[PDB]
Write a protein that binds this DNA or RNA. Sequence first.
RNA 1: GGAGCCUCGGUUGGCCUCGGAUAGCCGGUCCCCCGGGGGUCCGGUGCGGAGAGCCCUUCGUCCCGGGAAACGGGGCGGCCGGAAAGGGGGCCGCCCUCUCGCCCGUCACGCACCGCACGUUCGUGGGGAACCUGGCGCUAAACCAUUCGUAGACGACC
Lengths: 176, 108, 138, 109, 199
Amino acid sequence: MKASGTLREYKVVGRCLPTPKCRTPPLYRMRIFAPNHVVAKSRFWYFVSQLKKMKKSSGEIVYCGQVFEKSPLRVKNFGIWLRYDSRSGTHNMYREYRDLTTAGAVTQCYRDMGARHRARAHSIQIMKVEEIAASKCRRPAVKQFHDSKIKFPLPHRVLRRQHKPRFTTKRPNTFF
Amino acid sequence: FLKQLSSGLLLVTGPLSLNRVPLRRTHQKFVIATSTKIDISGVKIPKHLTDAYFKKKKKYEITEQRKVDQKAVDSQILPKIKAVPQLQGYLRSVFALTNGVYPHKLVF
Amino acid sequence: VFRRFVEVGRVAYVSFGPHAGKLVAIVDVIDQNRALVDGPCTRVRRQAMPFKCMQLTDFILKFPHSARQKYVRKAWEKADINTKWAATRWAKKIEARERKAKMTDFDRYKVMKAKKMRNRIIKNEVKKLQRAALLKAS
Amino acid sequence: SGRLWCKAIFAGYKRGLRNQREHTALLKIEGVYARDETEFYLGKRCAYVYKAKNNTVTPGGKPNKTRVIWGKVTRAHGNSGMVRAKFRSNLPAKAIGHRIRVMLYPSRI
Amino acid sequence: QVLVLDGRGHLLGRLAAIVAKQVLLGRKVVVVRCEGINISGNFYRNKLKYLAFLRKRMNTNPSRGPYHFRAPSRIFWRTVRGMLPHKTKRGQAALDRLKVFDGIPPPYDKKKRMVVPAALKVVRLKPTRKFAYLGRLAHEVGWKYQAVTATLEEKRKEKAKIHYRKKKQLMRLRKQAEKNVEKKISKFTDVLKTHGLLV
RNA sequence: GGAGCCUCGGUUGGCCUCGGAUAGCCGGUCCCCCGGGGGUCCGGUGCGGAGAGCCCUUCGUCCCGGGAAACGGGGCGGCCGGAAAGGGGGCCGCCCUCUCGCCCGUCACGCACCGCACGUUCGUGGGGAACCUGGCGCUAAACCAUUCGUAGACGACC
């Protein structure tokens, strides 16, 4: 999968074809994170092919929509269960983030998993996205923001727009 | 600027007391339309002057018909450009670009 | 020594983006490079915003770390920020640039003729201050 | 009485990495450094002024030593204020980095 | 019509590549105080990186090989020549518009020197990373004039101080001049203040 | 210290300067103390004693009125400061010049060349010839030959 742009969460459901043996196959609900709803469908069949003995041709997509976060204005401590791959075997990780949505917390995972562990997006299998309370957080770099009287300055203000006065006279300040 | 002519050329006239420009034709393409208006909706533009008036017929000498019309429209705008403060000084001045001045950077 | 702290309630000034030229108040601190920010009386919906597009003032107002928008507006109406902000020497020199930016060509002309005469009476006063300092100093 | 053309630099021809096509020039208008502000000088007429030995005529004047090749900008180039420009003849390659004039008179305001 | 750059604190390649475009576009550049240029990394690295450059000489006849320059300016002039098509004819037309100088000659110590802030140490380096002054590097590789140039720079530092010590006083009377002339310029001040010039 | 012909060219208002810090500056006061420094205080710091700028700003005139200017604008001599690749940089006089020089207004006018392009410069430009007119000036040196042999194939060198 190509973890491009900002990701979205999808409620893609499907089932096997109605057989002359079994009347109604059971409906299966899936939580896919994907750029668009097109690639979410093939990412849906990747998991159904492994979790069950089904394939794309012997099944169908019942419903494919994009779910929204119930409260995108409450900062929440998102925990993700990972199944990334290394060059020598695979591993499972429990990564924590402090984000807005279920979607953006996954975006902050693929880049951070792509930076620390050099992990490609196709090597990464999300299995559970669990929002946790504040006192139930584990990674401490997230836990340093759980304080009411949080207060800090911005030490070395890295100046941008340094090409509009490309030839100036003064030494530009990084203190404000 | 005063009015549009038939052909599409414009009737743009400088104050001869300020600009040394007569009733003259000038195409709209070669024009910097400044956002500075004077209410010339009360002047009386002469109907006898038209596109054939300003044709290059055939040494140019200002004909005695021509020196009438420059005076007759002047008698209303010349007080009007003095009812506006520092306007007759604006028209004597000539447009130019200095160092560090960019037309796309400014508004006029 | 620092005086500008990213805390809950410091008014900040958004630098770039579609909210440039606007005030905004920091509600929650998301991460090191992203903050939950809100300006109710300045046409900016509560959204996540990075720390680049903000230039913090020293206007601080007390309310909880995740208080909703009505409790943001009343504290903004308790301290009366917009009257306080327009009186600052910071906001006045922002307003002075756009006036010199929107300055009409004729407005560019009257200011030039006045610039010529405002500098002479400065220059002539310097001259009488030049020679009269050279009398008492000897 | 003052300069009524903007300052323009002839950086080079339209080139790829190892091929160039002389039929358009690449101008660097002084003042513009992004695509958004290139919109104003789009369409305006541009000219290269140089002088030669033999005297050549001047429309409305004594025959001078100066010659011109007229052109106009086609479209904006890059993301940093650069602009393409096509002339009547190809610009001679001695004009690299010299000053050409971008007059305003095809203005649309 | 002349670019006058001060070399204190600008990063070598980041400064050279910027002026390399400018010098090709027919704008004469004179770079001043080339000893103040700063390179990234610890000094032992930048020193050893240049000692390897001296080592790359012509084996059969060293009079024809790479002409290792020792002065700070000609070191900085060399890296500009690397970022320039010098083998062309238009490249030779570029190289002469460059005029590098160790310290400040008389044509420039009473002129305003510009700076390139897109290439500067205090922004384009993380403050914990190490960095080496080029004045030390050239001195320790064969340059002979770190000490005599330093005596000349210690001349103009107090020489231009007298100009600044006077210039403050020349305008402390000027801002004192407006304090007694306001009621005959306020009708010229407000027409400057309503268009944003004194506010 | 005067006018034309060739030729090579580019360019079209200037900025006359602290030093330096960037987890810090900048300006004033000196109520404090040493010989300029240290220490504060009073104000600015998204730099407005801001290069996101400042300065010059240029249609030419002719009269009348107002505001500023009386110290100023504009003449020929000394005088210092300048060596890193040195300014015609300021100051003292001078016998002539105006409250013209600029800013607001009135008066009247300068091919108003009938729509059109290389316009408007730095330009007494660099350089080469011929011509200006006087003041001021100036009356060599190298190479060859010859000689030497501290030198040397020939040159060169002494």
